[PDB]
Design a protein around this ligand. Structure first.
Ligand code: QXZ
Length: 327
């Protein structure tokens, strides 16, 4: 069967913590007053919640209320524990309150509001310096949560709020986040298609923090090459084929061989034989100002099939690509 795997960093952080830290099922939720918040407008809705802009009438501050649909109402304790564990952390969204929605009768998480610029619009105007600055800000969040024994598992542009005016960034939507425990087999049905790591696409369940570093690599590829998303698969099978057309099939077979993974037999007719592409193939007159040797070296160290070979968030922050960013 598959060869086991463990994170190369923050491996045992949860076992050295009291069970109260990671045993989210035993958590007793402290409830606030729903009357403190007046709903203003619906911002969106996913398959697990409805999101509203609201006003906290006790301080007139703008907030965001995530009302859980009963499908996620079930595993709310996990999200709440993770948000309370990470509160105050660099660039982590602040959970301000937990109230019971009087209409859905489900939990409603109250968060700080970010004056976000739609990523589709914002990514088009980002400069080489802005990409490096924002990537460093995301890394602070990722290294903090990883150091706290938590995997985000849904890193993507939609979950990175950017107030471009104040150059402020928050990592949001911790609904898929999980505590990392060495040797645990996790659900591969996490992240969004374009940012799923090869470990999810090949059904390797013993993954870790490094999954978020593949997702970050995809975001960086989209920003520097001005192609969003960079890997545009039609489904989870074609997603891996899109990856293999860039990284090659030989490194993919070496990765499955190393972990003793049996590739789904449907891949035999669609995968083909591809060699790795040099990153300059993706450079053209329209994105050349965002591409540098440091950017390509950094991307190359994030977009690796072998999750154990990817840069850690702390290692990524030490990379030369961030030397020009003011610290
Ligand atoms: C002022 O305009 C905005 C403000 C915000 N603010 C924001 N601040 C915090 C926060 C949190 C914790 N969750 C969401 C959020 C917004 C949203 C929209 C659709 C689906 C899920 C969503 N989640 N947000 N959104 C978001 C916006 O678009 C995503 C946005 O429109 C561009």
């Amino acid at each position: 069967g598959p060869v086991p795997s463990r994170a190369r960093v923050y491996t045992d952080v949860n076992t050295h913590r009291p069970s109260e830290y990671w045993d989210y099922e035993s958590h007793v939720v402290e409830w606030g007053n729903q009357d403190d918040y007046q709903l203003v407008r619906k911002l969106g809705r996913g398959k697990y919640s409805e999101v509203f802009e609201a006003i906290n009438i006790t301080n007139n501050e703008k907030v965001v209320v995530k009302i859980l649909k009963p499908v996620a109402a079930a595993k709310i304790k996990r999200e709440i524990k993770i948000l309370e564990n990470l509160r105050g952390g660099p660039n982590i969204i602040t959970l301000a309150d937990i109230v019971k929605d009087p209409v859905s009768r489900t939990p409603a998480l109250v968060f700080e509001h970010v004056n976000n610029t739609d990523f589709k619009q914002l990514y088009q105007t980002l400069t080489d310096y802005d990409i490096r600055f924002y990537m460093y800000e995301i890394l602070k969040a990722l290294d903090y949560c990883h150091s706290m024994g938590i995997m985000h598992r849904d890193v993507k542009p939609h979950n990175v709020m950017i107030d471009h005016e104040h150059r402020k960034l928050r990592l949001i939507d911790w609904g898929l986040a999980e505590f990392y425990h060495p040797g645990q087999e996790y659900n591969v049905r996490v992240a969004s298609r374009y940012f799923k790591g090869p470990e999810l696409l090949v059904d390797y369940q013993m993954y870790d923090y490094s999954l978020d570093m593949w997702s970050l690599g995809c975001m960086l590829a989209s920003m520097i090459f001005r192609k969003e998303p960079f890997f545009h698969g039609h489904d989870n099978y074609d997603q891996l084929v899109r990856i293999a057309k860039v990284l090659g099939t030989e490194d993919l077979y070496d990765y499955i061989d190393k972990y003793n993974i049996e590739l789904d037999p449907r891949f035999n007719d669609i995968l083909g034989r591809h060699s790795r592409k040099r990153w300059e193939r993706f450079v053209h007159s329209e994105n050349q100002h965002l591409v540098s040797p440091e950017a390509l070296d950094f991307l190359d160290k994030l977009l690796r099939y072998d999750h154990q070979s990817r840069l850690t968030a702390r290692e990524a922050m030490e990379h030369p690509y961030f030397y020009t960013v003011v610290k």
